[PDB]
Protein backbone atom coordinates (compact mmCIF):
# COMPACT_ATOMS: atom_id res chain seq x y z
CA UNK A 1 0.00 0.00 0.00
CA UNK A 2 3.19 1.91 0.19
CA UNK A 3 1.30 3.92 3.15
CA UNK A 4 4.59 4.50 5.18
CA UNK A 5 6.09 6.18 2.32
CA UNK A 6 3.49 8.39 1.94
CA UNK A 7 3.95 9.55 5.52
CA UNK A 8 -0.08 9.13 5.75
CA UNK A 9 -0.09 7.28 8.72
CA UNK A 10 1.59 10.21 10.46
CA UNK A 11 -1.99 11.16 12.08
CA UNK A 12 -2.63 7.94 13.71
CA UNK A 13 0.61 8.11 15.53
CA UNK A 14 -0.26 11.48 17.27
CA UNK A 15 -3.40 9.40 18.54
CA UNK A 16 -1.41 6.76 19.76
CA UNK A 17 0.74 9.20 22.19
CA UNK A 18 -2.57 10.23 23.42
CA UNK A 19 -3.46 6.87 24.80
CA UNK A 20 -1.59 6.07 28.02
CA UNK A 21 -2.32 3.53 31.21
CA UNK A 22 -4.93 6.02 32.69
CA UNK A 23 -7.07 6.55 29.70
CA UNK A 24 -7.24 2.19 29.58
CA UNK A 25 -8.62 2.40 33.35
CA UNK A 26 -10.79 6.08 32.17
CA UNK A 27 -13.05 2.96 30.51
CA UNK A 28 -14.23 1.82 33.67
CA UNK A 29 -14.72 5.01 35.27
CA UNK A 30 -16.89 5.94 32.06
CA UNK A 31 -19.71 3.67 33.26
CA UNK A 32 -20.77 6.12 36.34
CA UNK A 33 -20.25 9.37 33.89
CA UNK A 34 -22.20 7.88 31.54
CA UNK A 35 -24.86 9.19 33.01
CA UNK A 36 -23.79 13.03 32.88
CA UNK A 37 -26.60 13.20 29.81
CA UNK A 38 -29.55 12.19 32.44
CA UNK A 39 -28.43 15.10 34.53
CA UNK A 40 -29.01 17.23 31.66
CA UNK A 41 -32.91 16.54 31.53
CA UNK A 42 -33.44 18.70 34.80
CA UNK A 43 -31.81 21.18 33.72
CA UNK A 44 -34.19 21.00 30.26
CA UNK A 45 -36.77 22.35 33.04
CA UNK A 46 -35.37 25.46 33.32
CA UNK A 47 -36.53 26.43 29.23
CA UNK A 48 -39.99 25.50 30.54
CA UNK A 49 -40.54 25.40 26.54
CA UNK A 50 -40.19 29.38 26.71
CA UNK A 51 -38.65 28.49 23.24
CA UNK A 52 -41.82 27.39 21.79
Partial sequence: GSVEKLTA???L???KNE???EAELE???SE???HDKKEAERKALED???DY
Fill in 9 to 11: DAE
Fill in 13 to 15: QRL
Fill in 19 to 21: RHE
Fill in 32 to 34: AAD
Fill in 48 to 50: KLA
Fill in 27 to 29: RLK
